Write an enzyme that holds these catalytic residues in place. Structure first.
Site, short mmCIF file in Angstrom:
data_model
loop_
_atom_site.label_atom_id
_atom_site.label_comp_id
_atom_site.label_asym_id
_atom_site.label_seq_id
_atom_site.Cartn_x
_atom_site.Cartn_y
_atom_site.Cartn_z
CG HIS A 73 -1.61 -1.32 1.37
ND1 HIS A 73 -2.60 -1.72 0.50
CD2 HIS A 73 -1.58 -2.23 2.37
CE1 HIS A 73 -3.07 -2.90 0.87
NE2 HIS A 73 -2.43 -3.27 1.97
CG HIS B 146 2.22 5.60 6.10
ND1 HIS B 146 1.89 5.42 7.42
CD2 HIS B 146 1.18 6.26 5.53
CE1 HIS B 146 0.69 5.90 7.65
NE2 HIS B 146 0.23 6.43 6.49
CG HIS C 166 -1.24 8.55 2.01
ND1 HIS C 166 -1.91 7.34 1.89
CD2 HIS C 166 -0.99 8.74 3.33
CE1 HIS C 166 -2.14 6.89 3.14
NE2 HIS C 166 -1.50 7.65 4.00
CD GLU D 265 -4.74 9.25 2.87
OE1 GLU D 265 -4.49 9.28 4.10
OE2 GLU D 265 -5.13 8.19 2.23
CG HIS E 231 -0.55 10.07 7.34
ND1 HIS E 231 -1.50 9.35 6.61
CD2 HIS E 231 -0.85 11.37 7.15
CE1 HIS E 231 -2.35 10.18 6.07
NE2 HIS E 231 -1.97 11.43 6.35
CB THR F 221 -6.59 7.56 5.74
OG1 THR F 221 -5.18 7.20 5.56
CG2 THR F 221 -6.80 8.85 6.56
#
Ligand SMILES: [O-][Cl+3]([O-])([O-])[O-]
Ligand SMILES: [O-][Cl+3]([O-])([O-])[O-]
Ligand SMILES: [O-][Cl+3]([O-])([O-])[O-]
Ligand SMILES: [O-]
Ligand SMILES: [Zn+2]
Length: 258
Positions: A62, A92, A94, A104, A117, A196
């Site tokens: 992911h 991590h 996104h 996000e 995050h 999330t």
């Protein structure tokens, strides 16, 4: 579990295995800056990373997680809207396929190229797995990434990605200082929300920094060379691993700054 970010397994599908996807306290959200209230009673954030012990970096299919020793209060987040002490477990990101999407959270509907995050859990619960079952279990520091000049303290991260290209690969990642990922200012918005990612548990105090960090285009292009897939499988580039904004519902976003 078979969730992902694709059209067949992405966020619009998550609610079937994870019904809380349609709950009252879901993240991320759009931060409407004119509606967020300055709250003079919010303290300064205390980010105490001096004693952080990074260990390992993992491609989990992911994102990639930079993991820390959370067996002791080394790297802890306190203050701000929080009561109690929260241990850093991993950070991590996104990101998007292009610089116009990736975050996000959004700020007055603006999307950033990426969002970091830093995930922390409340030591009153003893372990992460217990903490995610509680409404005050996690504190997540969110930091926007814009593209411009390089972030020097990101490069050690970017440089190792080649070695964790595919899902399940990990590499040693000791002696990484996460302070090098932070902007100058700790001004923040805060609201009650969720992970999330599935299981989307409603256990997070969100703390989203107002000031983005700048990273280079080469830095973020290297993120987009990772793979969601396993070794030797059809290559599916790890891009657009972001959940879009969810309804705010009955929630108040608070600002730490006038
Ligand atoms: O093919 Cl869908 O992903 O609309 O179910
Ligand atoms: O020299 Cl590095 O940027 O890989 O740490
Ligand atoms: O980054 Cl989250 O831990 O809130 O999913
Ligand atoms: O996440
Ligand atoms: Zn995240």
């Amino acid at each position: 579990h078979h969730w992902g970010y694709g059209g067949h397994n992405g966020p619009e599908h998550w609610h079937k295995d994870f019904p809380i996807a349609k709950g009252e306290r879901q993240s991320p959200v759009d931060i409407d800056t004119h509606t967020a209230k300055y709250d003079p009673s919010l303290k300064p954030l205390s980010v105490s990373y001096d004693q952080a012990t990074s260990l390992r970096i993992l491609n989990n299919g992911h994102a990639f997680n930079v993991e820390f020793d959370d067996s002791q209060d080394k790297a802890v987040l306190k203050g701000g809207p929080l009561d109690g002490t929260y241990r850093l477990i991993q950070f991590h990101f996104h990101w998007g396929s292009l610089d116009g999407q990736g975050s996000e959270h959004t700020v007055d509907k603006k999307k950033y190229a990426a969002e970091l995050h830093l995930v922390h859990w409340n030591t009153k619960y003893g372990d992460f797995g217990k903490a995610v079952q509680q409404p005050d279990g996690l504190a997540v520091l969110g930091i926007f990434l814009k593209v411009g000049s390089a972030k020097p303290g990101l490069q050690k991260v970017v440089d190792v990605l080649d070695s964790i290209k595919t899902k399940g690969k990990s590499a040693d990642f000791t002696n990484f200082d996460p302070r090098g990922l932070l902007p100058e200012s700790l001004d923040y918005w805060t609201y009650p929300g969720s992970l999330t990612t599935p299981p989307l548990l409603e256990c997070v105090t969100w703390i989203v920094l107002k000031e983005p960090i700048s990273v280079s285009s080469e830095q973020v292009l290297k993120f987009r060379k990772l793979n969601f897939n396993g070794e030797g499988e059809p290559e599916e580039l790890m891009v657009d691993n972001w959940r879009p904004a969810q309804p705010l519902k009955n929630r108040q976003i608070k600002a730490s700054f006038k």
